[PDB]
């Protein structure tokens, strides 16, 4: 369990979008967009946007924060969902 400010903010944005998502599904094509926006707000460019986004998504997935599902038809060919621990961490503040 290690959530820097950017990762935590990305998680909160993801939760907000899921709340405003119609059917409660999140393809990675939108996760990357959310990460782009949060990193832009936080004003830091260690590497490219894509590599940082991929690393962060993988880190949360392995940190038991997101669940990934392989769906070719989905935008980005994957569907992501908040895990119960991620839900708890997000709603702890929300």
């Amino acid at each position: 369990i290690s959530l820097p400010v950017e990762r935590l903010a990305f998680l909160m944005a993801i939760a907000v979008l899921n709340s405003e998502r119609l059917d409660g599904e999140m393809s990675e094509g939108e996760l990357i967009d959310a990460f782009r926006e949060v990193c832009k707000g936080f004003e830091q460019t260690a590497e490219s946007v894509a590599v940082r986004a991929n690393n962060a998504i993988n880190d949360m997935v392995r940190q038991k924060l997101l669940n990934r599902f392989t769906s070719e038809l989905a935008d980005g060919n994957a569907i992501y969902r908040l895990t119960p621990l991620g839900i708890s961490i997000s709603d702890y503040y929300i």
Partner: protein
């Protein structure tokens, strides 16, 4: 916008279906009670204590609980995939039956969960629409509508996932079989796999390369290089914008004619364009005459119609001045 909020915050660091059924029953009872309370009606305080405190908190919490149950099933889905993957590493050809069972049970569990979800989604939606209908019982019930608008999606969203997850699993399942039908059928003993691993590890002890057809590409003629036009154009830069003003003489003339003509409408006097134009043009010099005639007509034709125009008898071209000006119009009678 939430990014600044997070930045300034500065922070950092049960799959049983009987459960789902009992939460669904509780939700049905509470939702029906709240809908009936709303339908009965009451004052603002009654409306509140019956549709905002009981409903809001209870429905939010229990929909969240149901969603958490779905997430726990999702976690179980992930874990069973991982378990199958690990099993195929340990038994290879002998785990086929085990994996098929696990797939069967997981699919069945998914079927029961979807069935339980759809067992009450429609009626709960009906109750929510009933609460929507009863919401309008007061003008201050705006917040209720939000919930009656929010609590919709969640429910439907939940049901959506109940199928979408399944849509995913029935896919994954197939893939697994293909693997068993493809990966292990030609590697029953798995020896080929180990031998490939050792070949990879010790490839450069005997570096070999395959041969592939490498037909030539059809070389083409490069299109002529494009050269733009450069001429270093120079010229005088424009001065400050001048200005001109519009003459309202025609406006004054129109006002004069409208005032002179309003009397005809006032008295409903039959207007004859010939005589009126002939009389009025005498007040102006000839070059302006046209610009007068037009305006007068514009003012005159808005005042009633001419009844003779339905008689089928064409009107004549009455002269209205010297120099040869003529007009064709019936008398304006019907104001």
């Amino acid at each position: 916008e939430l990014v600044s909020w997070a930045r300034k915050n500065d922070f950092s660091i049960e799959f049983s279906t009987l459960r789902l059924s009992m939460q669904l029953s509780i939700v049905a009872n509470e939702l029906h009670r709240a809908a009936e309370a709303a339908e009965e009606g009451g004052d603002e305080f009654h409306w509140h204590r019956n549709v905002f405190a009981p409903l809001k908190y209870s429905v939010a919490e229990i929909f969240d609980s149901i969603d958490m149950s779905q997430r726990l099933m999702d976690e179980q889905q992930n874990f069973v995939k991982e378990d199958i993957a690990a099993l195929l590493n340990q038994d290879w050809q002998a785990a086929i039956a085990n994996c098929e069972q696990l797939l069967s049970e997981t699919s069945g569990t998914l079927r029961e969960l979807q069935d339980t979800l759809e067992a009450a989604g429609d009626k709960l939606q009906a109750n929510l629409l009933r609460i929507q209908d009863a919401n309008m019982g007061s003008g201050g019930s705006e917040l209720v509508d939000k919930l009656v608008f929010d609590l919709q999606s969640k429910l439907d969203r939940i049901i959506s996932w109940g199928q979408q997850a399944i849509d995913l699993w029935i896919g994954y399942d197939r893939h697994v079989h293909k693997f068993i039908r493809t990966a292990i059928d030609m590697d029953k003993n798995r020896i080929f796999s180990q031998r490939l691993r050792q070949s990879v590890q010790h490839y450069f002890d005997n570096p070999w390369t395959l041969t592939v057809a490498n037909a030539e590409r059809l070389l083409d003629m490069r299109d002529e290089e494009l050269a733009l036009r450069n001429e270093e154009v120079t010229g005088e830069l424009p001065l400050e914008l001048e200005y001109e003003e519009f003459s309202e003489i025609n406006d004054q003339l129109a006002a004069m004619i409208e005032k002179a003509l309003l009397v005809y409408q006032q008295e409903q006097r039959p207007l004859d364009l010939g005589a009126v134009l002939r009389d009025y043009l005498a007040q102006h010099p000839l070059p302006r005459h046209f610009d007068v005639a037009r305006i007068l007509v514009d003012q005159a034709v808005r005042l009633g119609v001419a009844e003779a125009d339905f008689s089928g008898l064409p009107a004549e071209w009455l002269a209205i001045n010297d120099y040869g000006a003529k007009v064709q119009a019936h008398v304006i009678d019907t104001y």
